[PDB]
Structures are given as structure tokens and as C-alpha cells.
Design a protein around this motif. Structure first.
Motif, short mmCIF file in Angstrom:
data_model
loop_
_atom_site.label_atom_id
_atom_site.label_comp_id
_atom_site.label_asym_id
_atom_site.label_seq_id
_atom_site.Cartn_x
_atom_site.Cartn_y
_atom_site.Cartn_z
N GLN A 165 0.20 -1.28 0.05
CA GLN A 165 -0.39 0.14 0.10
C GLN A 165 0.98 1.15 0.07
O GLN A 165 1.54 1.65 0.99
N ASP A 166 -0.01 2.24 -0.62
CA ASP A 166 1.51 3.37 -0.97
C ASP A 166 0.46 4.07 0.24
O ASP A 166 -0.09 4.87 -0.09
N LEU A 167 1.66 4.72 1.06
CA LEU A 167 1.45 5.69 2.40
C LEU A 167 2.51 6.47 2.19
O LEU A 167 1.81 7.35 3.25
N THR A 168 3.18 7.19 0.81
CA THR A 168 3.92 7.36 1.29
C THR A 168 3.40 9.49 1.43
O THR A 168 4.07 10.59 1.75
N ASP A 169 1.81 9.83 1.56
CA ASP A 169 1.87 10.97 1.70
C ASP A 169 1.12 11.34 3.23
O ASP A 169 0.92 12.41 3.62
N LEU A 170 1.62 10.50 3.97
CA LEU A 170 0.65 10.39 5.32
C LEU A 170 2.05 11.01 5.79
O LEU A 170 2.97 10.54 5.82
N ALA A 171 1.74 11.81 6.83
CA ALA A 171 2.51 11.93 7.86
C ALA A 171 3.57 11.75 8.79
O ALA A 171 3.01 11.58 9.54
N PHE A 172 3.50 10.56 8.75
CA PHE A 172 4.52 9.87 9.44
C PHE A 172 5.98 10.56 10.13
O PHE A 172 6.02 11.19 9.28
N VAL A 173 5.54 10.24 11.27
CA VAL A 173 6.70 11.22 11.87
C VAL A 173 7.64 9.57 13.16
O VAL A 173 7.25 8.48 13.00
N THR A 174 9.24 9.95 13.27
CA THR A 174 9.41 8.98 14.65
C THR A 174 10.19 9.70 15.79
O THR A 174 10.12 11.40 15.63
N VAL A 175 9.58 9.29 16.58
CA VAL A 175 10.04 9.59 18.03
C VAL A 175 11.12 8.61 18.69
O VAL A 175 10.36 7.55 19.02
N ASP A 176 12.24 8.95 18.86
CA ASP A 176 13.06 8.21 19.53
C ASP A 176 14.22 9.20 20.62
O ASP A 176 13.96 10.06 20.10
#
Ligand code: MG
Length: 644
Positions: A184-195
Motif C-alpha cells: 500500500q502506498d502511504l507516502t502522503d501520510l505525515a508519519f514521524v519517528t520519536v526516539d
């Protein structure tokens, strides 16, 4: 007849038989017959009857050494125009006298050099062995060299494997993989990493959407199983390591090579990355409605630290990111509070207690000990990972796919009874639940009604001991402290081999089963219990390595504070004295039983107390004390305290 030797205090110990009853026999030092800690031995029961508790045994032969290399300090001196060689083993349970093979000694090897040696021959009747130096590790006083020696003594690989890195360097980002129909192409969603700011494990990203009926959570996990084929050189090395290793100074031994860990399976901002997504729909109360698992493509928009997010939370700062990121984070915190409230409602045990870290300088010398604090951003991230882990466990179970669970059984009635009596002496309430039947919710309520007790810290400590260690199992056992009947590890495949295996199961059974044979699926199924066994056995070694490293560094730090007075509380009582946990550094020091003033004290095992025969004074777990640091025992890496 056959069993594993464990050495303890004074280098006597016990043998745990390989039979079904896993029977335990005591073995005194004089009956070890050359055997060392962890060795598999053949043993016989002593013709003496029984002093009590258990039978006694003697070792007959060694079936398999636990180790082939041992760490030690090399010493050389000249006496009478003759070089004399000596090795002092790092492990105080290594009790054999050593004759050093001079042909193994380089001419330039100087005194006080850390080395690794092997045993070439041994004489079980005199506890003498011939040893050869196999590796020169470096200056014996260098703390980093000692940390590497400790890993070697725990069988933990830490040197880079060039062959494996070369195989990994052949892998690359296939631009066409994102156009596969299953991904599934999800490249438009505003994913982030928190580490954490220093972490290079960036294998999970989150995005949270609001809908009128509630929330949609997307947990995107780096698609490591897509890159690491089963039984490849990379896979075999990962399976040997079982896990990344984390030591002070942010020293990490990664489970996987750089081209995966820092590139193709690192969800770096603005890079297209292949992932496995756990998508979960929630109602407005935080209750799960639906879920889907699927391979995807994402582009993380931002890499945040816990520190940045916490500062943004308390309005002490602002995040330079798109408004779509701000709204996802706001919904993530809202969703997380709801999920937390639902898990508490259904039953979950919060075992948070004081935790510390050792700060070291650039040469790995310890500077101070810091207490870790509750952090709202870690709590949010961990909450979302737990719900993904639990959901994946249920999806695999629902589809009747065998998997390694992460399990944590309910503790026995006898262990609970012991706990209740110890903590009752501290004004911790008497619980009302049935000890056969106690639920996670009931333990939580018990903890909650004592939260203000001055002894809440030793209460949680003792409860953690009572519960014992979680572990992996293919049998569907509960996870009592998380509160679920099914749980596994799915969200950290860059650093845990079980998570990598869980990803492989998803691919082979749910995502692209037509690309695999039933023999491949059955081959993996048949290996799951041995994978779990190896990971469980290695986890014990890793925990021991962390304990060794923390004892080495903390006693090195404390060696400059002799004479200082510390307040603290009794964390354990043994036949050889009192362990007092120091308030200022959270470390246990030993108060030796013989030196306790004002009376002669006797160890009473049933209550685990010391009682004075003349005054009836009692030392018990939880008691507050003040004591002086009198010495560091560098052989055992212990802090010795005397009551003041
Ligand atoms: Mg992460």
C-alpha cells in the motif's frame, strides 16, 4: 546423572539435572572435579544421606564446557633471571590455578594487559590447568577494554563481522517495489519517528488520524524480513546474536549490519522506505474496533527526540514541522491517554520504579549516576507499540499460525504468600484477592492503594522478583503484567530476532503465501521452539552482561568515595549479610553479617531476616539504614558497607 553446574558464593554451587523434574543437587567446591560455571557435567549422588533440602552430588566428568575463551589479566615478572607468567581471571568463579604456555606469549606482551585465554589441559585432582593466550585485548585498566572483556566472558559477540557487512552492502533500494499490488502506498501520510536523541534504531514510525467515530492508528515498522532472507549469512548472524546489545556510554552492538540498520531499514526523514503497517481503528473511548496488517511504503516527515516532543508538550518550545504532523501528534497523545485508560480498566500491572543510568566520559570512565524520570513522550510511544504488539499476536493466533509469544505467567500461590508477609511488615495492605485466581486488575488495585506508602519502592522491587522474568514461548500462555492472553514482539525487528521472525511469519502466511512452499512454512514452524530457546538462553546472558558491566563501572565510580556515608534501605538479606540499596546511586552494597554491631546475628531463612540472639533485634527487607562505604571488593565487584 547429567546436568548444568551453577557456581555461587565461595565457589560451591549446585547442579540442575537435565531430567524432566529438573532436580537440583548441591555440590561443594571440593567435589567439582575441574568443572566451571555453566559446564554440562556427568555427576553422581553422594553416598551420604541428606543433610536437608536436597541431595548432594559430585562431578564425574565434564561433558561440554560452557566457554572456550575466558578473560583475564596477564602479569609478567622476572625473578632470578627467569620470566614468570601469571593470569588472574576476570571471573571470580574461575577458580583453577593456571600454568601459562610461554609459546603463546608474545615477546612484547606487558604486565597488566587484558587477554583472552583457553584451557589446553586440566588436572581435576589438583585444580590445575594449562592455558594459552589467544587474544590480546588491551590495557587492563581501560574501562572500555573491561566492558569488552565482560562481553567475551558472557559469550557476546561485539567485533564487526566484515563478511556479513559485505553481504549487506549488496542490498539496495528497489524503486519498483513500491508499485507491487500487495504494497500500500502511504507516502502522503505525515508519519514521524520519536526516539531517544542518541538512538540509531529508527525502525518504527507513527501516524494518527481522527475520524468522526474515533481514531485510526498507523504503526509502520521497517520491513526487515523483506531484506533479510531466511538462512542467509545476515540472518544466521542475527540469529546467533538474537538481539542488539546496549551498554553505557550509548555503546551499541547492533544485531544487523549498517546497510540495514542505518539505511534501508532506518526510517529517515524524506526517504521512501518499505515497511509493514499495523493499522488499528479506535472508537472515541480508545476501544479497538478493527485492524489491518499490510506491507506499505512511507516517507517519514520528521525525526523527533523525546526531548523535543516533551518540550513541545509543556509549551516550553515549538516543533518546526507541517501542520499535518502537529495534528497527528496531538491525536496520538489523545489516543494514547484513552488506550492507557482502557488497559487499566481491563487489567495491567504498572511496574515502574526507580531506574538509573551511568554517565561516562569520552574515555569510558564513569562520572556519575543519573535517575531516569517519567517521560510523557516515551509513555505515548510505548503505549502505541504495545497495542501493535498485542494486535499482531491476536491476528496470528486468530489465523491459527504458530508463533513465539512473549509470555509472563501468573505467579504461584506460595510466592505471593511470601510476598504478602514481607511487605505486610512495612504497612503495605493485606490484599483481599484469591491467590489462586488473582487477575492483573487485582494486582494493579493492590499497588494503587499503597502508592503513598514510604516503602512503595521495595514493594515494586519485591513484586518484580515474585513475578520473575518474562520469556518467549510457542505455547499460548498469558502475559500477566501487560494484561493480555496473547502478546508478542513485532515492533523492533532491527534489534530483536523474535520480531524479525514475527515479520517472516506475516509474509509467509498472510502477505504473500503463494511465494512460499508449505515445506518452508512447516520448516519455520518446526524451528520456532528452538528459536525461542536460543533467544531465551541468550537473553539471560545479555542481562548478566549488563549486570556485570554495571557492577564494574559503579564500583569503579565508588572506589573514589571510600569513607562516605550513605543512607538507604535493605533490599535483600542472605546468610552472609545485608544488601542495602543506596539512595544516592540505587546500587546494592553488602553489609557483612559478622561485622554487624551490638549482638550476634543469625540468619532466619523462612522470613529472610537477621535476628540478634541476645537483643532480638531484627533486620528485615525494607528497613532504613545508614552505612559507611568501607571498601570496594574488586575481585567480586562489590561495595562493602559498615553500619554507622
Ligand atoms: Mg523508535
Amino acid at each position: 546423572l547429567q546436568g548444568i553446574l551453577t557456581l555461587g558464593n565461595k565457589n560451591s554451587g549446585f547442579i540442575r539435572s537435565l531430567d524432566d523434574d529438573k532436580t537440583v543437587y548441591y555440590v561443594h567446591y571440593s567435589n567439582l572435579t575441574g568443572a566451571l560455571d555453566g559446564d554440562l557435567v556427568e555427576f553422581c549422588k553422594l553416598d551420604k544421606p541428606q543433610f536437608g533440602d536436597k541431595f548432594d552430588a559430585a562431578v564425574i566428568t565434564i561433558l561440554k564446557r560452557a566457554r572456550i575463551l575466558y578473560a583475564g589479566n596477564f602479569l609478567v615478572d622476572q625473578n632470578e633471571f627467569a620470566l614468570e607468567y601469571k593470569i588472574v581471571a576476570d571471573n571470580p568463579r574461575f577458580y583453577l590455578t593456571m600454568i601459562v604456555n610461554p609459546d603463546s606469549i608474545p615477546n612484547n606482551l606487558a604486565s597488566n594487559t587484558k587477554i583472552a585465554f583457553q584451557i589446553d589441559e586440566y588436572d581435576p585432582d589438583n585444580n590445575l590447568c594449562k592455558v594459552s593466550v589467544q587474544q590480546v585485548l588491551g590495557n587492563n585498566d581501560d574501562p572500555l577494554i573491561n566492558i569488552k572483556a565482560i562481553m567475551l566472558d558472557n559469550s557476546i559477540v561485539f567485533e564487526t563481522n566484515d563478511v556479513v557487512e559485505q553481504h549487506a552492502n549488496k542490498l539496495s533500494f528497489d524503486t519498483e517495489e513500491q508499485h507491487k499490488a500487495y504494497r500500500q502506498d502511504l507516502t502522503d501520510l505525515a508519519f514521524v519517528t520519536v526516539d531517544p536523541t542518541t538512538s540509531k534504531d529508527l525502525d518504527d514510525a507513527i501516524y494518527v488520524k481522527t475520524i468522526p467515530t474515533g481514531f485510526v492508528l498507523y504503526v509502520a515498522i521497517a520491513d526487515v524480513a523483506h531484506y533479510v532472507n531466511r538462512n542467509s549469512e545476515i540472518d544466521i548472524e542475527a540469529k546467533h546474536k538474537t538481539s542488539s546489545i546496549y551498554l553505557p556510554g550509548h555503546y551499541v552492538v547492533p544485531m544487523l549490519p549498517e546497510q540495514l540498520s542505518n539505511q534501508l531499514c532506518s526510517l529517515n526523514p524524506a526517504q521512501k522506505r518499505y515497511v509493514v503497517v499495523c493499522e488499528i481503528s479506535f472508537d472515541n473511548q480508545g476501544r479497538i474496533k478493527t485492524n489491518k496488517l499490510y506491507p506499505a511504503t512511507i516517507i517519514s516527515k520528521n525525526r523527533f527526540s523525546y526531548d523535543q516532543v516533551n518540550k513541545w508538550l509543556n509549551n516550553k518550545s515549538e516543533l518546526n514541522c507541517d501542520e499535518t504532523v502537529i495534528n497527528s501528534l496531538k491525536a496520538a497523545f489523545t489516543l494514547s491517554d484513552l488506550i492507557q485508560a482502557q488497559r487499566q480498566k481491563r487489567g495491567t500491572i504498572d511496574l515502574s520504579h526507580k531506574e538509573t543510568e551511568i554517565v561516562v566520559d569520552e574515555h569510558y570512565f564513569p562520572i556519575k549516576i543519573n535517575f531516569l524520570v517519567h517521560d510523557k513522550a516515551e509513555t505515548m510511544i510505548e503505549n502505541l507499540m504495545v497495542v501493535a504488539n498485542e494486535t499482531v499476536a491476536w491476528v496470528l493466533t486468530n489465523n491459527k499460525i504458530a508463533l513465539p509469544y512473549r509470555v509472563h505467567p501468573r505467579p504461584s500461590k506460595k510466592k505471593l504468600q511470601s510476598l504478602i508477609e514481607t511487605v505486610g511488615e512495612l504497612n503495605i495492605t493485606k490484599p483481599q484477592f484469591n491467590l489462586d485466581t488473582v487477575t492483573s486488575s487485582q494486582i494493579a488495585s493492590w499497588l494503587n492503594e499503597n502508592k503513598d506508602n514510604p516503602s512503595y519502592e521495595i514493594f515494586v522491587i519485591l513484586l518484580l522478583r515474585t513475578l520473575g522474568k518474562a520469556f518467549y514461548s510457542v505455547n499460548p500462555l498469558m502475559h500477566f503484567s501487560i494484561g493480555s492472553n496473547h502478546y508478542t514482539h513485532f515492533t523492533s525487528p532491527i534489534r530483536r530476532y523474535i520480531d524479525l521472525t514475527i515479520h517472516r511469519l506475516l509474509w509467509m502466511h498472510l502477505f504473500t503465501p503463494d511465494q512460499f512452499t508449505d515445506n518452508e512454512r512447516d520448516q519455520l514452524k518446526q524451528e520456532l521452539e528452538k528459536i525461542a530457546d536460543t533467544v531465551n538462553d541468550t537473553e539471560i546472558k545479555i542481562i548478566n552482561c549488563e549486570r556485570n558491566a554495571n557492577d564494574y563501572l559503579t564500583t569503579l565510580l565508588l572506589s573514589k568515595q571510600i569513607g562516605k556515608t550513605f543512607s538507604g534501605f535493605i533490599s535483600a538479606i542472605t546468610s552472609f549479610g545485608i544488601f542495602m540499596r543506596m539512595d544516592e546511586n540505587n546500587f546494592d552494597g553488602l553489609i557483612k553479617i559478622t561485622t554487624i554491631p551490638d549482638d550476634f546475628f543469625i540468619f532466619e531463612k523462612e522470613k529472610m531476616v537477621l535476628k540478634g540472639r541476645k537483643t532480638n533485634k531484627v533486620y528485615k527487607i525494607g528497613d532504613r539504614l545508614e552505612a559507611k562505604l568501607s571498601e570496594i571488593d574488586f575481585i567480586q565487584k562489590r561495595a562493602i558497607l559498615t553500619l554507622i
